Amino acid sequence: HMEAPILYEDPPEKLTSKDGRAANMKITSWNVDGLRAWVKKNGLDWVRKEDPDILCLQETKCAEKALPADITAMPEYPHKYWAGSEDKEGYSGVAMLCKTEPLNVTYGIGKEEHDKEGRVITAEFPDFFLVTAYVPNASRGLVRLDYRKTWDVDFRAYLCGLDARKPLVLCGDLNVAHQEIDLKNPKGNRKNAGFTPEEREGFTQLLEAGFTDSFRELYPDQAYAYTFWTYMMNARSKNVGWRLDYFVLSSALLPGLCDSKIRNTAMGSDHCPITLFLAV
Amino acid sequence: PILYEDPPEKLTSKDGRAANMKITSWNVDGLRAWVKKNGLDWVRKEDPDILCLQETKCAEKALPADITAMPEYPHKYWAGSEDKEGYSGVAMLCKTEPLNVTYGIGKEEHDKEGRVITAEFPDFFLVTAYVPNASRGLVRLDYRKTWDVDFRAYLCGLDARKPLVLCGDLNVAHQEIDLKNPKGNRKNAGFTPEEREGFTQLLEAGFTDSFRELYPDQAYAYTFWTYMMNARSKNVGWRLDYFVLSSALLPGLCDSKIRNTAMGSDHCPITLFLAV
Amino acid sequence: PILYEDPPEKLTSKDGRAANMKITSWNVDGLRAWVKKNGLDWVRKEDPDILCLQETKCAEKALPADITAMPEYPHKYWAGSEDKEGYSGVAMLCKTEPLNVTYGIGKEEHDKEGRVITAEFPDFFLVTAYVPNASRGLVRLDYRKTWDVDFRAYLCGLDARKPLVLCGDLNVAHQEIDLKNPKGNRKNAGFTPEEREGFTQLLEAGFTDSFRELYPDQAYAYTFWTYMMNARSKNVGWRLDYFVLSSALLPGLCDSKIRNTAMGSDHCPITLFLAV
Ligand SMILES: [Pb+2]
Ligand SMILES: [Pb+2]
Ligand SMILES: [Pb+2]
C-alpha cells in the first residue's frame, strides 16, 4: 500500500493580456540556492532557453567578487545588479539582470536594520517598479519569527510607498505558502517557517493593501502547483512541495497581465523558476 | 600566551592642556556580586570624577547600601528595566551634579530595558550604555541591528547640539585586532559582520574610538575575557568596552586606559582622561 | 585484552555553544563490500549531517544503487581514480548542498587517485582525505613525504581564507599513544618518524587533533585494526582516522567520537560534533 503522488503540469503560455494585448515583456524569478552551484548545474543554459527580458535571482549566496565569469559576463544582460554580495553573509544575496537599463536601481527597503542582508533590489522603469526579494525565513524553531513579523510590516510599508508613485511587480522567494492549497502538507507545517499563521496573515495583508497574486488570480483553483521542494526524501519527484515564489502585481498592472507560469521542469535548485508574461 | 601591560597614563592632551576630567566605565557583571567582590575598593582607588556601570542587573530597590551610600559620589543615577525585573541596567555616579539627566534613547521598544543614561554637562554630554548582546545562537541579533540604527540616530542628534563622550560595554570587537580569535568567532555575539558594520557606521558618523585613536597598532589589548577556558589568565579576550568621542573632543583627549589588572568581573574597567 | 569504551557524547562546545553540526568519517575498505556488510544501516542510526568515506575503491559508474539513492543525502560527491582503478577513492554525502565542491589539491601528481574532496560552506571548509599509505617496505615513503608537504600547503591555503575541518584516514598514528605496538612499528608504514613528523608539522601550522585535544591521556583508543590475527578482538590497533580542526574552531568543538562498535571495515567510523 501507499498514497499516490499528484503531479502538476504547468498550462500552456497565455500570450494575451487581460485587456487583449500581446505579451511583450517576460520576467523570470528564481531562487537558485547557491549561485555558484546553480551555475555549475547549468542554470544559465535554462535561462538562455527562457530568454527573459529581466532575470531576478534569490539566495545567490555569493559575494559579487566571487561571482563566476559565466554569469557576470553574460551578453544577454548588459545591466546586472547584485545585492548582499557580501562574502561574510553567505546566507542571502539577490540579483537582477536586465536587458534594458532601468531609470534607477536601489538596494534594500530604506531601513538599515533590514538592509544589512542583501534581500531586495528595486529597479525603476518609466511605467512601473520591479521589486525582487528574498524574504527573511522564520527559520528553525521559528527563532526568527518575531523579526519576520517586523519585516513583513516594514516591507509592506515600503511596497505601498512605491505603489503610490508607480505600479509595481514584486517577485521572488517570499518564504510563505499563502494558503493551504499552496503546499502539500499544511497540517504538518503550521508551526514551521513558511506556514505559520503570522506569515500567512502578513501576506494576506499585503494583498489587501492593493496587490494581486498573479498565479492565484489566473488559476484560483489549481492545487499542487509548487515552486519549492525540499531536497530531502525525493520530495520533488513526489511533488511534495510549497509555493513560495510569486509575482505579485499592483492593481493597475492586471490589465497587462498575460500569464504567470511555474517552470517545475527546470532543475538546478530546490526551487524552480517562475515566469511572468506582461503586456507593457 | 601574549600578555598586555597598559601604558602609563598620559595626562597631557592633543592641544597641550592638562587632563582635568577622569571617567571610568565598567561592566560589573551583576552589581550585587561585584560589590561583594570588593569592586568599590578599586573605584575608591581610581577615584574617577564620574563612574559609569553597566550590567548592574539590580533594581534600585535592591541596590546595596554600600553603593547608594557612597559619599564620594553625591549624585547617582540608575536605569533599570521598566518591567521591575533587574535585567541589564546601567548607572552613573557623579561628584558633580549634571545640568540634566535623561534615560533611554526616546524609543519605547529600546527604553524597555535600562541600557542608557545621558548626563548633560556644560561642555559635553556623557552617554553610558550597555548595548544589547546578540546572545546565544545570535537570537537577539536582529533586535541588535535595530538598536544599532536607533542608538546611532540618537547619538548623532546629541552630537548636533553638543560634543559627547560615549562609554560602556558596546558589545562588539570592532576589528580583528580587537579580539584574540577573530576567525573562530565570526558567528559569535560581538563579532558578527552586522555588529562590526554597525560600529563602523557610528564612527563614520563623526565619532572616534578613543583607545584605537591613541594606539592604532596596539594588539592584545582587551576589556573582556570569557570566564570559561581560563581565558583571562591567558589573555584570550575581546575589546568590548570603549570611550567613543565626538571629533570636537579630540583636542582635549589625553588618554584612554584599560585597567586589565582590576578584578571582579569578566570585563575590566576602562578609564578616560580628558581636558575639557 | 585491554579494550576501550568511547565516552558518552558531549553536545556543547568549550565556549558554550550547542552542537549544530554532526560529521562522520569512515574508511570503508571497499564501498561495495561495506554496503553488503550493512554499513548503511549503521550510517542511518548515526544519521550525521555529512558522511565522508575513504578507500571506496569503486568507480562512480559501479556504485551500488543502495548508496547513490539514499534519500537522506541529496548531495553526493565522488572522487575516484583516473581509469576506474580500485585505488583509494573518497566520497562526501551531504544533507545540505555546499557552496562549492572541489576535487584534489591542485596537483595532477596527487589528483590521479581520488584522495580529497573539499566542500566549502559559509563558515568553513570541510576536507575529507585518504592519505597515501607508505605501503609495504616503505617503498612509497618518498612520495608520501612529498604528499605531506603539498597537502599541508593546500590546507594552509584554505585555512587563510576560512577555518576548516579535516577528516579521514590520514595514515599515521601521531604518537606512541596512538597505537598498541609503538616499538614494533617504528619502521612500518603509518609510524615512521617521517610520517609522524609530517602530522606534527601540520598541527603546528595552526591545526588541532580534535580527539587528542579532548582526551589527552586516553590510551587504547584506535580506529583501525588489521583483519588478521583477530587484532580487533584483542584491540591491537592504530588511531589512523582523525578530525583535525583549524585551531580557531576549537571553542566550537563539542566532541570527537570513535565508534569502535560499528563493524564492516577494518576501520571504525569517527564522528565529530561541532558548533559552527
Ligand atoms: Pb536554502
Ligand atoms: Pb555577565
Ligand atoms: Pb572491504
β-bridge partners, A134:
A173
CB atoms within 10 A of CB C45: 9
- Cα dist from B20 to B96, B187, B274, C79, whole Å: 13, 41, 6, 69
Nearest partner of B167 among B83, B19, B49, judged by Cα: B49
- Cα dist from B170 to A77, B39, B160, B247, whole Å: 44, 21, 21, 19
Crossing angle of helices B193-204 and B141-161, rounded to 10°: 10
- Cα dist from A134 to A84, A270, C40, C257, whole Å: 11, 15, 37, 39
**Helix H or strand E segment including C44:** helix C39-46
φ, ψ of residue C244 in degrees (nearest 5): -100, 125
The DSSP annotation for A237-260 comes to GGT--B--EEEEEEGGGGGGEEEE
**Helix H or strand E segment including B158:** helix B141-161
Calpha distance B154→B131 (Å, rounded): 13
The size of chain C, in residues, is 276
Nearest partner of A167 among A106, A255, A98, judged by Cα: A255
Kindly give the pairing relationship between strand C100-103 and strand C116-120.
antiparallel
- Cα dist from A5 to A2, A224, B107, whole Å: 9, 10, 53
Question: Is residue A241 exposed (0-12), middle (13-18) or buried (19+ Cβ within 10 Å)?
Answer: buried
φ, ψ of residue A221 in degrees (nearest 5): -110, -5
Nearest partner of A198 among A138, A127, A113, judged by Cα: A138
Calpha distance C64→A34 (Å, rounded): 29
> SS3 of B29, please?
coil
Active site amino acids of B: 130, 169
Calpha distance A134→A128 (Å, rounded): 20
Calpha distance B223→A55 (Å, rounded): 49
CATH superfamily of the domain spanning B1-276: Endonuclease/exonuclease/phosphatase (3.60.10.10)
Nearest partner of B94 among B49, B157, B129, B58, judged by Cα: B49
- DSSP-assigned letter for residue C29: S
Which residue has 551531504 as its cell numbers? C94
Kindly give the pairing relationship between strand A211-213 and strand A245-250.
antiparallel
Chain B hits for A113, CB-CB cut-off 8 Å, are: 142, 145-146, 148-149
Calpha distance B223→B218 (Å, rounded): 13
CB A248 within 8 A of CB A274: no
The DSSP annotation for C49-77 comes to SEEEEE-----GGG--HHHHT-TT-SEEE
> Cβ separation of A116 and B142 shorter than 8 Å?
no
Nearest partner of B223 among B269, B166, B174, judged by Cα: B269
> Which sign does the torsion angle of CA A265, A266, A270, A276 carry?
negative
Chains that touch B (3 or more CB pairs under 8 A): A, C
Task: Please identify, in words, the CATH class of the domain defined by A1-280.
Answer: alpha beta
Q: Is C163's Cβ below 8 Å from some Cβ in B?
A: yes
CA angle B255, B256, B257 (to 5 degrees): 115
Nearest partner of A174 among A253, A120, A98, A108, judged by Cα: A120
Q: Which ligand is nearest to the CA of C95?
A: 1
Q: Is C97's Cβ below 8 Å from some Cβ in A?
A: yes
Provide the greatest CA pair distance for chain A: 59
**Cross-sheet strand order for the sheet of A94-98:** A79-83, A94-98, A54-58, A25-31, A274-278, A257-262
CB atoms within 10 A of CB C34: 25
> Which sign does the torsion angle of CA C39, C40, C45, C51 carry?
positive
- DSSP-assigned letter for residue A55: E
Q: Closest approach of chain C CAs to the CA of A107, in angstroms?
A: 23
> Cβ separation of A88 and B186 shorter than 8 Å?
yes
Q: How far is CA A71 from the centre of its chain?
A: 19
Resolution of the structure in the document, Å: 2.3
Cell numbers found for residue B235: 589573555
- DSSP-assigned letter for residue C224: B
Q: What is the CA(C182)–ligand 2 centre distance, in A?
A: 48
Calpha distance C91→C56 (Å, rounded): 7
β-bridge partners, B77:
B92
Q: What is the CA(A32)–ligand 1 centre distance, in A?
A: 9
Q: How far is CA B194 from the centre of its chain?
A: 20
List all residues 6 or more positions away from B205 whose beta carbon is below 8 Å from its beta carbon: B152, B155, B156, B159
Nearest partner of B233 among B269, B271, B266, judged by Cα: B266
Cell numbers found for residue B213: 585613536
> Cβ separation of A233 and C71 shorter than 8 Å?
yes
CB A130 within 8 A of CB A163: no
List all residues 6 or more positions away from C111 whose beta carbon is below 8 Å from its beta carbon: C103, C104, C105
Which residue has 546553480 as its cell numbers? A38
CB B172 within 8 A of CB B144: no
Considering only the beta carbons, identify the residue of B137, B186, B228 that sits closest to C15.
Answer: B228
> SS3 of A8, please?
coil
Question: Is residue B18 exposed (0-12), middle (13-18) or buried (19+ Cβ within 10 Å)?
Answer: exposed
CA angle A48, A52, A55 (to 5 degrees): 95
CB B208 within 8 A of CB B215: no
The DSSP annotation for C126-189 comes to EEEEEPPP--GGGTTHHHHHHHHHHHHHHHHHHHHHS-EEEEEE-----SGGGBS-HHHHTTST
Calpha distance A85→A61 (Å, rounded): 7
Spans of all domains in chain B: 1-276
β-bridge partners, C167:
C128, C243
CB C95 within 8 A of CB C50: yes
CB A274 within 8 A of CB A52: no
φ, ψ of residue C183 in degrees (nearest 5): -50, -45
- A92, A115, A116: best mutation site toward chain B, by most B Cβ within 10 Å? A116
β-bridge partners, C274:
C21, C253
* Per-position b or e across B186-212, b if 16+ CB within 10 A of its CB: bbbbbbbebbbbbbeebeeeebbbbbb
List all residues 6 or more positions away from A128 whose beta carbon is below 8 Å from its beta carbon: A166, A167, A168, A169, A250, A253, A280
> Cβ separation of B185 and C16 shorter than 8 Å?
no
Calpha distance C131→C141 (Å, rounded): 12
Q: Closest approach of chain C CAs to the CA of B221, in angstroms?
A: 19
Calpha distance C84→B82 (Å, rounded): 70
